[PDB]
């Protein structure tokens, strides 16, 4: 879905 | 580059007293100097150098 760094 | 607005000032070295040697000793000698950046030092805006070229 989504990775958030 | 050399720029008057962003000039950095002057490094100089002087004799405080004098070099003193005893007899049987060289009266002249060399000092060597080194420069390096501190941990608060940074650079920016990447550019090509003038220290290398390729004529033809």
């Amino acid at each position: 879905g989504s990775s958030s760094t | 580059i050399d720029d008057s607005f962003t000039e950095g000032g002057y490094i100089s070295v002087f004799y405080q007293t004098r070099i003193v040697v005893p007899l049987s000793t060289p009266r002249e000698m060399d000092i060597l100097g080194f420069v390096s950046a501190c941990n608060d030092f940074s650079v920016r805006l990447l550019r090509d150098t003038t220290h290398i070229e390729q004529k033809a």
Binding site: - | Q16, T17, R18, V20, V21, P22, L23
Partner: protein
């Protein structure tokens, strides 16, 4: 210390200035008192003081003199020797009143084959004797105050005999410490000795000392620095050896009261 720390190796930093030494003989704090600002309970002029902090409390190096077999000794007065030193001198001449402590660092290196010993004395109120035997207390302001060049001691008293136009200067005889007392006793004043086999410098930290909390720096000198050869310079078999002596001095905790226009003294 097992991490290398030595009594002989010091670094001093005041303002934008650092002194290093690798051959010290510890350092002295006169009368055990470190310099301080004037406390409210001892204050006297009521106006807000000026405290120039790093602008004036930094190491100033005076003109280097030369030590030879014929040297009888040198003297300086504080604050007089610093009167033309950067913003300290400026702050001094703009105000009626000023007080200051000092770190005095005398420098003189040589070699393991030279020998000699300088007694370096800091004397509170170092009043020196005049050249006249027809008049007393007549040394002029100009001659009393040499500025950074300082003055010198002599081995001989020689009276000024020109009565028409008197020299009006000091005639400070070395074994009489320039003041009629014996030099061998000058060690009761805060001091160090530069004995060339042992050390290449002397460091004296001087408090402001006076019978007042603050005073006229231009009229009055609080401390005198007297440097005399206790054991004469000698090297190998040279008839005429020479080594330099340099004074670097820093004002400490100086404050000034009574701001007005600048003083322009008659110095010559």
């Amino acid at each position: 210390e097992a991490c290398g720390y030595s009594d002989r190796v010091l670094q001093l930093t005041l303002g934008n200035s650092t002194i290093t030494t690798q051959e010290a003989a510890n350092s002295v704090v006169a009368y055990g008192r470190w310099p301080e600002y004037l406390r409210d309970s001892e204050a006297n002029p009521v106006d807000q003081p000026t405290e120039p902090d790093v602008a004036a409390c930094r190491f100033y190096t005076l003109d280097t003199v030369s030590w030879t077999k014929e040297s009888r000794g040198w003297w300086w007065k504080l604050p007089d020797a610093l009167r033309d030193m950067g913003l300290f001198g400026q702050n001094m001449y703009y105000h009626y009143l000023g007080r200051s402590g000092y770190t005095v660092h005398v420098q003189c290196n040589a070699s393991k084959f030279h020998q000699g010993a300088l007694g370096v004395f800091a004397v509170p109120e170092m009043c020196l004797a005049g050249d006249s035997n027809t008049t007393t207390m007549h040394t002029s302001y100009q001659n009393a105050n040499p500025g950074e060049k300082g003055g010198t001691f002599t081995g001989t008293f020689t009276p000024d005999n020109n009565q028409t136009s008197p020299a009006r200067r000091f005639c400070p005889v070395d074994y009489l410490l320039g003041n009629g007392t014996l030099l061998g006793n000058a060690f009761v004043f805060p001091h160090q000795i530069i004995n060339l086999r042992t050390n290449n410098c002397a460091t004296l930290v001087l408090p402001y000392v006076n019978s007042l909390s603050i005073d006229s720096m231009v009229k009055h000198n609080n401390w005198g620095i007297a440097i005399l050869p206790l054991a004469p310079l000698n090297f190998a078999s040279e008839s005429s050896p020479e080594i330099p002596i340099t004074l670097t001095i820093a004002p400490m905790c100086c404050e000034f009261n009574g701001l007005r226009n600048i003083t322009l003294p008659r110095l010559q």
